[PDB]
Every structure is written in structure tokens, then in C-alpha cells.
Amino acid sequence: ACDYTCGSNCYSSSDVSTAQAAGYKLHEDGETVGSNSYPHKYNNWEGFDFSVSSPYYEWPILSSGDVYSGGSPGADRVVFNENNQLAGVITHTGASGNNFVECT
Ligand SMILES: [Ca+2]
Numbered sequence: 001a002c003d004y005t006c007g008s009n010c011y012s013s014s015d016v017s018t019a020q021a022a023g024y025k026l027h028e029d030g031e032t033v034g035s036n037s038y039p040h041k042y043n044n045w046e047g048f049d050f051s052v053s054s055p056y057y058e059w060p061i062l063s064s065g066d067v068y069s070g071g072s073p074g075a076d077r078v079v080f081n082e083n084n085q086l087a088g089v090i091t092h093t094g095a096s097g098n099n100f101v102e103c104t
Contacts, residue, residue: 003015003016004016004089004103004104005103005104006061006075006076006089006090006091006093006103007075007091007093007094008093009063009074009075009076009091009093009103011061011076011089011103015061015065016061016078016086016089018067019059019060019061019062019067019068019078020059020078020080020084020086022059022067022068023038023039023057023059023068023078023080024039024059024080024084026038026039026059027039027057027080033068033069033070034060034068034070034071034073035070036073038058038059038060038068038073039057039058039059039080040057040058041055041056041057041058042055042056042057042058042077042079043056044056046099046100048088048090048100048102050079050087050088052081052083052085052086052087053081053082054081054082055081055082056079056080056081056087057079057080057081057082058077058078058079058090059077059078059080060073060074060076060077060078061074061076061077061078061089062074062076063076075091075092075093076089076090076091076092076093076103077089077090077091077100088102088103089102089103090102090103091103
């Protein structure tokens with residue numbers, strides 16, 4: 001069973017934790033990776049019900065289980081705040097353009 005399902009992608013809590021930790025470290029270090037410079041700010045204009053406060057940052061979570069190191073980021077993202085709190089898991093999958101929908 002999946003803890004988070006992003007379209008057809010299946011993620012376990014452990015997967016989320018690993019991705020989050022990588023993203024947060026880069027954030028602390030004032031560093032970014034990839035052509036789209038992740039991690040980057042995330043604006044909650046869609047109003048997802050995140051129980052944690054902003055600012056929020058987004059970092060790619062890969063279907064493969066590997067930690068994002070540049071290259072194609074896919075459609076899935078983990079969202080964390082300034083305090084390294086998990087805000088949620090979201091995806092471009094099933095959303096128009098560059099918009100997002102929440103992973104279930
Ligand atoms: Ca996995």
C-alpha cells in the first residue's frame with residue numbers, strides 16, 4: 001500500500017522522509033540543483049490544507065526512490081517549511097499546465 005499516491009506513482013513515508021531531508025539540507029546550505037533550481041519557493045495560491053506554516057519550499061521526489069540530483073524532476077514534489085516540517089506531497093500530474101494537485 002502507498003502512503004502517498006501521485007497519479008500512478010506510489011510513495012512510502014520512508015521515501016518522503018529521504019526526499020525531504022535532501023531538500024532541506026540544500027536549503028540550509030543555500031544551494032540548489034537542476035535547471036529549475038530546487039529546492040525553490042512554493043506559493044500556496046491553490047489553498048491546499050497544509051497544517052504547517054509558510055514559507056514553503058518544493059523539492060522533487062522521484063518515482064524511482066532515488067534522490068533528485070539534477071536532470072528531469074518528474075511531476076512529484078514534497079513540500080516542506082522553514083522549520084523542516086512536512087507540509088505535504090503534491091503533483092503536476094492531473095493538473096493543467098504547471099499547476100498542482102495533492103497526492104492522495
Ligand atoms: Ca519507494
